[PDB]
Amino acid sequence: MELRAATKLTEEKYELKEGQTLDVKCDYTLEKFASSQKAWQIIRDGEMPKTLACTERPSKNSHPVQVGRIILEDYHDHGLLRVRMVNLQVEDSGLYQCVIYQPPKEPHMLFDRIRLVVTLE
Amino acid sequence: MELRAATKLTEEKYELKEGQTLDVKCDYTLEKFASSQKAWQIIRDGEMPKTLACTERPSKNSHPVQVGRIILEDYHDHGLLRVRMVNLQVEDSGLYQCVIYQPPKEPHMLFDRIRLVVTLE
Numbered sequence: 001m002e003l004r005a006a007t008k009l010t011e012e013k014y015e016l017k018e019g020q021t022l023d024v025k026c027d028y029t030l031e032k033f034a035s036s037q038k039a040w041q042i043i044r045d046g047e048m049p050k051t052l053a054c055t056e057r058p059s060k061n062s063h064p065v066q067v068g069r070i071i072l073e074d075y076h077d078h079g080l081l082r083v084r085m086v087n088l089q090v091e092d093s094g095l096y097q098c099v100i101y102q103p104p105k106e107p108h109m110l111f112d113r114i115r116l117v118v119t120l121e
Numbered sequence: 122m123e124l125r126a127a128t129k130l131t132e133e134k135y136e137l138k139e140g141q142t143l144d145v146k147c148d149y150t151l152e153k154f155a156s157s158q159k160a161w162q163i164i165r166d167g168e169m170p171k172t173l174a175c176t177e178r179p180s181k182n183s184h185p186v187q188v189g190r191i192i193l194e195d196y197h198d199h200g201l202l203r204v205r206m207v208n209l210q211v212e213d214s215g216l217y218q219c220v221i222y223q224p225p226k227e228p229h230m231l232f233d234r235i236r237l238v239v240t241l242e
């Protein structure tokens with residue numbers, strides 16, 4: 001049986017300097033995802049992500065999640081997941097992505113990645 | 122910066138009977154991916170894969186890799202990565218995908234997934 005390569009996930013280069021804060025808006029728009037569990041992860045080689053911060057399950061509006069220098073927030077009203085990394089270190093450089101936990105029997109809607117490049121002043 | 126969950130990743134619902142052998146062909150086709158490391162993974166919720174079998178890095182042609190009932194083979198000459206799961210069992214049911222280890226700056230190409238469904242005799 002044949003499995004095609006009919007998909008590509010880009011890496012939107014996002015550059016900032018050390019000390020500065022990362023601000024990303026992950027517009028899932030479809031309220032059909034509001035209650036869905038979402039997370040922010042750093043992508044390791046082989047498409048193996050490591051979860052840095054996730055929302056509760058279900059995900060209730062206006063309940064920011066703080067994990068270290070990470071702030072995750074699910075705004076249902078505008079249907080978007082807002083992610084933030086304060087006081088970026090150069091070591092933070094890497095591939096990141098927002099993720100919406102969705103069931104196996106349904107096609108998955110995927111966010112493109114963020115190639116974070118943190119530089120020195 | 123704001124992104125959208127703009128790409129679909131579908132699960133090819135595939136049915137097989139216990140005891141059969143799942144034979145899958147993953148067409149990366151481009152010579153550019155011939156020596157890249159590759160793997161067979163089962164996906165868990167949150168887009169978190171569990172690597173069941175991977176090639177060497179680099180991947181050498183016709184160097185069969187076997188782990189358990191899983192047999193992986195990279196056919197450079199065909200631009201295909203072949204995967205086999207011998208004597209299938211009900212527990213083998215799940216969401217699977219071939220993966221090509223790709224560098225961070227390049228858009229990552231992704232193979233269609235397969236929702237394996239193994240049922241009783």
Ligand SMILES: N[C@@H](CCC(=O)N[C@@H](CS)C(=O)NCC(=O)O)C(=O)O
Pocket residue numbers: 037051052053054057101166167
């Ligand atoms: N984030 C993980 C990945 C497992 C997962 O999603 N874990 C936390 C997320 S920060 C959670 O309670 N999620 C449960 C669920 O969705 O299974 C860990 O570092 O333990």
